[PDB]
Amino acid sequence: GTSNRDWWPNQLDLSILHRHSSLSDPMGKDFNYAQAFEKLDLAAVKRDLHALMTTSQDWWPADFGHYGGLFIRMAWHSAGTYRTADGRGGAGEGQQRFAPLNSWPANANLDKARRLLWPIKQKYGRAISWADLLILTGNVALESMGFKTFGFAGGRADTWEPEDVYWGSEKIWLELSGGPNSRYSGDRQLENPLAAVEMGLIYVDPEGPDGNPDPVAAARDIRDTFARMAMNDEETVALIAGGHTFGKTHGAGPASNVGAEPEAAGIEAQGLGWKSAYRTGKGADAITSGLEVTWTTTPTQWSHNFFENLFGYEWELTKSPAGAHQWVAKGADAVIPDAFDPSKKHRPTMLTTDLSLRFDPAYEKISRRFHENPEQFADAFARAWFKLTHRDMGPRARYLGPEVPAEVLLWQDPIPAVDHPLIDAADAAELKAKVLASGLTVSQLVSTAWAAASTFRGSDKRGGANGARIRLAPQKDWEANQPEQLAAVLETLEAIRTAFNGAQRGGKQVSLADLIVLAGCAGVEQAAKNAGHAVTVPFAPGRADASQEQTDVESMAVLEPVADGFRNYLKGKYRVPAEVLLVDKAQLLTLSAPEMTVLLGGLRVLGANVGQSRHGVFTAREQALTNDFFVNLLDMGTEWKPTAADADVFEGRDRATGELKWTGTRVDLVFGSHSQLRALAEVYGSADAQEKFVRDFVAVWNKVMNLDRFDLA
Amino acid sequence: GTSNRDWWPNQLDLSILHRHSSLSDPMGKDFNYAQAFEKLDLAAVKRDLHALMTTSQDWWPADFGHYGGLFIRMAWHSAGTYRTADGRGGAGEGQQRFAPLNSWPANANLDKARRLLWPIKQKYGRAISWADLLILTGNVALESMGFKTFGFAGGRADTWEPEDVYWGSEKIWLELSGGPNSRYSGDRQLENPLAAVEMGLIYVDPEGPDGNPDPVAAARDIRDTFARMAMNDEETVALIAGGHTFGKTHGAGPASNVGAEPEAAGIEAQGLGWKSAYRTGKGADAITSGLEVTWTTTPTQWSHNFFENLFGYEWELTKSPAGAHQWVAKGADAVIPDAFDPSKKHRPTMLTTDLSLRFDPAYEKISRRFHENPEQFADAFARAWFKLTHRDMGPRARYLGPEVPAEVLLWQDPIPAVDHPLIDAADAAELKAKVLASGLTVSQLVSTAWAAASTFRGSDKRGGANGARIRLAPQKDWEANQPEQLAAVLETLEAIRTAFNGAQRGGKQVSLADLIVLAGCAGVEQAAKNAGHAVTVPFAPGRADASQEQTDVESMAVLEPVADGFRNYLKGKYRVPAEVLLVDKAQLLTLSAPEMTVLLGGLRVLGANVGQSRHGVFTAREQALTNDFFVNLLDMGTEWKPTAADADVFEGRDRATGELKWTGTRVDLVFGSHSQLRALAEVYGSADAQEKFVRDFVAVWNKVMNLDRFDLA
Ligand code: HEM
Numbered sequence A, B: 001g002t003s004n005r006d007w008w009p010n011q012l013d014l015s016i017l018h019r020h021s022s023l024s025d026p027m028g029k030d031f032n033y034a035q036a037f038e039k040l041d042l043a044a045v046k047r048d049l050h051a052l053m054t055t056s057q058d059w060w061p062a063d064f065g066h067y068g069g070l071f072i073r074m075a076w077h078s079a080g081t082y083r084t085a086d087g088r089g090g091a092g093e094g095q096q097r098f099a100p101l102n103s104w105p106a107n108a109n110l111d112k113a114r115r116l117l118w119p120i121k122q123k124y125g126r127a128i129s130w131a132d133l134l135i136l137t138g139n140v141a142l143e144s145m146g147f148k149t150f151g152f153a154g155g156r157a158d159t160w161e162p163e164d165v166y167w168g169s170e171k172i173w174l175e176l177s178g179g180p181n182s183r184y185s186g187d188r189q190l191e192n193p194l195a196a197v198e199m200g201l202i203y204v205d206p207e208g209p210d211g212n213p214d215p216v217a218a219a220r221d222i223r224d225t226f227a228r229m230a231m232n233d234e235e236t237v238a239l240i241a242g243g244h245t246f247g248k249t250h251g252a253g254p255a256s257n258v259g260a261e262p263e264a265a266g267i268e269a270q271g272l273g274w275k276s277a278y279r280t281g282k283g284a285d286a287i288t289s290g291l292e293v294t295w296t297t298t299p300t301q302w303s304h305n306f307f308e309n310l311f312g313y314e315w316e317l318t319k320s321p322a323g324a325h326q327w328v329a330k331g332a333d334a335v336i337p338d339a340f341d342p343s344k345k346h347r348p349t350m351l352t353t354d355l356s357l358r359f360d361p362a363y364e365k366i367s368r369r370f371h372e373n374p375e376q377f378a379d380a381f382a383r384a385w386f387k388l389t390h391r392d393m394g395p396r397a398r399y400l401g402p403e404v405p406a407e408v409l410l411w412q413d414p415i416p417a418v419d420h421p422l423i424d425a426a427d428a429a430e431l432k433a434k435v436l437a438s439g440l441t442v443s444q445l446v447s448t449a450w451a452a453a454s455t456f457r458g459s460d461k462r463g464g465a466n467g468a469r470i471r472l473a474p475q476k477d478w479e480a481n482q483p484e485q486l487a488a489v490l491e492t493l494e495a496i497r498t499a500f501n502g503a504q505r506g507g508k509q510v511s512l513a514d515l516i517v518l519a520g521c522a523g524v525e526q527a528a529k530n531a532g533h534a535v536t537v538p539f540a541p542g543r544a545d546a547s548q549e550q551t552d553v554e555s556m557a558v559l560e561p562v563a564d565g566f567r568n569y570l571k572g573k574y575r576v577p578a579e580v581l582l583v584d585k586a587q588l589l590t591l592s593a594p595e596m597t598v599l600l601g602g603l604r605v606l607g608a609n610v611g612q613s614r615h616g617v618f619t620a621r622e623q624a625l626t627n628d629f630f631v632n633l634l635d636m637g638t639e640w641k642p643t644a645a646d647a648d649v650f651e652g653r654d655r656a657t658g659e660l661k662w663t664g665t666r667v668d669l670v671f672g673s674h675s676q677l678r679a680l681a682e683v684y685g686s687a688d689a690q691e692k693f694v695r696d697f698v699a700v701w702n703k704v705m706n707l708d709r710f711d712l713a
């Protein structure tokens, strides 16, 4: 069946903005997961999970009689797809149960793990999501095996179709670097936004880079990919050694015995995959990764035996029974228990990537410290597991249930509690009149509030206007934010604030975060008045101001917009065309195509462009809120051509005289070119549409201003 | 960007059920197009279209000073994609303006035609849809040139994204038959559901079959494709000769001068395509099809000169300036005017497919009658043009505006007017109790109402329970409908009806169409009661009973379900897997994936399978409305394998004992296999889901019963 994708494989794809419709969702449109979860008996679920750990099923028997290691791995894979570049991936939507992640080679036999959880999921129904259950199961596994966790938050709502994520361009699973779709170039530079070394892996190749078993070069890939998942050296060593305290790998015979991944298997397999023709196909004969390593002498119990073994032996390169590279301890006795046969024991073994923790010099110092001070290892792993499994959940206001840790962590981008009366509607009217009387323009007011709010991304629920981080490093210096113009606006708003706060009784005060957003609303109201329309823009107070010490500058760098079509901004030249980058940004802001359309047309005429560029400013009444962008864009009296100097800039000329009327970028003109976008632009550029344009614009403006407002839920 | 479709190209695609979401729609969710249209000043729009006809734009000058021919072709191609096999295609959703149709080769330069209409669309805004405007413009063209049309109905709501239609498997535009994706097999048998001879054509190749200029062989393709668009011989001849009374073709120079179609063109082209490097690229130099034919001596005036020329000359095979085969009149004078140069004249010319009208012997008799009696030609054409342009609009209740023809046509599947009081809620409860006391079972009641209602297809809005056509030929004999069981049910319901109607005063009566649906409602209520649940299933009366004389039996043949997964029914063996056919049926019924899932699980346990097959009947309490289908399907204690006899039938056996518990088809087991469907099945198979299952089942049942109820809007 030939599709539009087949004929025009480079046309823009708008269907990523219309996912997650009420159509695909089986729950009612009033379903609120937070409310269902807050009534769950969480203690009862944990008891059932504890029982499950040692209730072996014959279709996938438990190693050592205990499923703990399998479930820790299941939870670390759920969380492990996270990339800090876009916030996409992670455990927070339960995507491991959908394509493609359900079928990634690195997720082999996690299908079995999820199926073992079906009875519990069934018993508790809508009150616990799959997404929450995968993480909670990991926690229970750790607890069952003697490790005390740092805590747990519920609230990850289930999703019902696959997320649109760019996982890479390779067309072969586990393709090694340098191919026609290589994710690597230069001196082993991994392309943004990717955070894994091969297609279908979580972070790195356990045999070493491109399969070459050198622990030192593996360490370099470990460091780069874990940093791209927001983890530093200490967290990385704690997580890897912590995880590999438990369980085992599975490589009992050749990989060619393993059949189709779940999305390719027959219908009779009922959602499972990787069926194996090697001996019994499971248990003692299991094949998952192809490696055959068991790390400690008590694989079902928390121990300090990982680092005793790593440092206490010298290591020899060898091969598993499937042919994979792995390491065995020189001269050791057979001290490692067998998973099924009490009369067998095995020598200690390690992956190349485990040896990285000893042979990379910076890791070695951390690993030695953890070896000599196991209580520090325990605490570091507990904190890192919490971070790993919660890093994509967003502000602490979304954390549900009775095990949420009280300690505030820097990586949560924390926002102080509000402890004072908030401004009311009379106060807001007074503050808007003050903002307008100060001389700040529409363009300055709109641009500043857009800059503050538009850092939000729905993928990990980071960013937005709450916190007033626009005033702090590094946001205040981002080129897209226009740092000199920004400084002058914030200085005037800070004087307004100081004067209003100084006059109040009781404890009433306004935060700068609220005033930035309020001043943007006044801008939009003034712009509507310039056009002859009487419009009130909704505002909700309650934002608070975070400090510089609560704002990790390195972690904040990934929110920098290097492309923001809403301000017609591009920081450099990229391989991806600018209109694909606009749709990507709309997706992170949670906008539909009609919302993206309205929003961009309105921003153009209000003067939100970076550096006051005229590109896309198709109006003779700038700073007035009108539908001019659409009416002028669609005027067939104008002809467009790319410029000689720059192919990404276009001149719009009167068709009859040749006279220049406008210029635009690709972000501008795509609205008059892409056949779906142009259909939307036509609605807003019609003669009956001016009031609809204004109303829709105010709605989407308000939506963006509130994206991070999880305190108002 | 590698996608799920790239890795698993044969997995089922559920996204076709979730198009047309409120997310992608720029109009508000209360927008009602019918209400906007009913206030349009249609006379004022027609006056503007009339002025447009002779107002040439320089970017695409009008042939002969008149855009009429161009707009008739635009309106004929908008309607000409219709296929009777599935009802997909046609003019009713304005799909010509989206991909792929906007870029089909046969639609070359219609982009210019649509752009000419933008100023009128802009003026009238939401009160006239693009869909309606395309057709209206064609009508006004005809009127302006002296032809009396049969009428016009508004009401085609605009759509906002491409519809998912199977247009063929070819990967090359206009690929000749016999390739690796051939749409032809056997003795030139075109595969259902296609209705064109090549990918990107409307019906046929104007040069002749696979480019061979034989009028006789071309006639066979004309007849076959037009029949597949619901047009007989008379209507076919009227349409082709009627259309080719006007205007001209465009082939002034070689085709290699013509650039990229609209979806492939550069962004600067602003949605237009086929830019030509041949001389001025337009007007006198235009290239569209590559043919260069002008049929009549007054191309901008209705005449009977097409048939005067077709019969008054002998014809010689020749070539256009682009190299296409075409025909020229032997020994004729230069009598045909030139489109731009008043001092030039040309000889009469024809397409191969024009000459089909004279050299096929059945066409020749009709064409001679139309030649001798041009008043008959005019009436046939008017009726055919109406049918062509309205055939996908659905029941007459959807027709809006002041020009709707009052004559009721057989192809409209007409429903008589209701002229008596309707039954009220107390009457409906009395009739339900009488149906249940007759002895009819849950299974008989649900199966009969499902059979009557499930013929609906949202592609052309044909079928549904209104009319009670299930009691007439040919429905009453369709194998899926279980003809002997159906006849017994209808006999009992007809006695109930006769008794209730005989006892009334004051005109009140119940139609059999309403009683069939009410009886199905009683069945569902009883099934809920058998499970321990009291529900009321909504019912809306107002259907009427059509007669056999108002039912075209041949036209009804395309509504026969040959695959109906909801009844576990497959009439024969097909190339396409049965699960793909289930999703295709759900799309025709307008169901989402959650609605399809609920509905199928419920139908299984209510006994709706054809022939009382136990396949998929995963319950020990058949005829009770429970979620047993889902609970049992998802039980990991059962193992499934295909049978030896039949690979499309599966046995479900206890995993521990080997005991046979169930059997199912691919349609049953897909719900436990496909990762998105299994996620939906899990929600309904949870321990907390019984009330949700019942409520959602009742909702989707009611939706299906009401699909054709455009009288209630
Ligand atoms: C450099 C990063 C890492 C690499 C290359 C990696 C590699 C692997 C591989 C190849 C397996 C074997 C799969 C099989 O054949 O069954 C595995 C098992 C496992 N990993 Fe990791 N690992 C990494 C980090 C982690 C982390 C961060 C955790 C958890 C905090 C984790 C916990 C586990 C556990 C518990 C198992 C045992 C599974 C079982 O008992 O079935 N690993 N690892």
Ligand code: HEM
Pocket (backbone or CB within 6 Å): B063, B068, B069, B070, B072, B073, B076, B203, B204, B205, B206, B222, B239, B240, B242, B243, B244, B246, B247, B248, B249, B250, B251, B287, B288, B289, B290, B291, B353
């Ligand atoms: C066997 C069926 C048909 C074939 C093969 C056919 C073929 C074509 C071709 C190849 C063109 C020239 C495109 C160009 O170069 O500009 C054309 C023009 C046209 N056709 Fe058809 N046609 C068919 C049926 C119809 C019908 C059913 C109608 C309307 C009732 C229609 C109305 C027209 C008109 C009005 C034009 C003139 C366009 C203009 O003036 O720009 N045709 N036809």
Ligand code: NA
Pocket (backbone or CB within 6 Å): A087, A088, A089, A090, A092, A392, A459, A460
């Ligand atoms: Na994410």
Ligand code: NA
Pocket (backbone or CB within 6 Å): B087, B088, B089, B090, B092, B392, B459, B460
């Ligand atoms: Na249709």
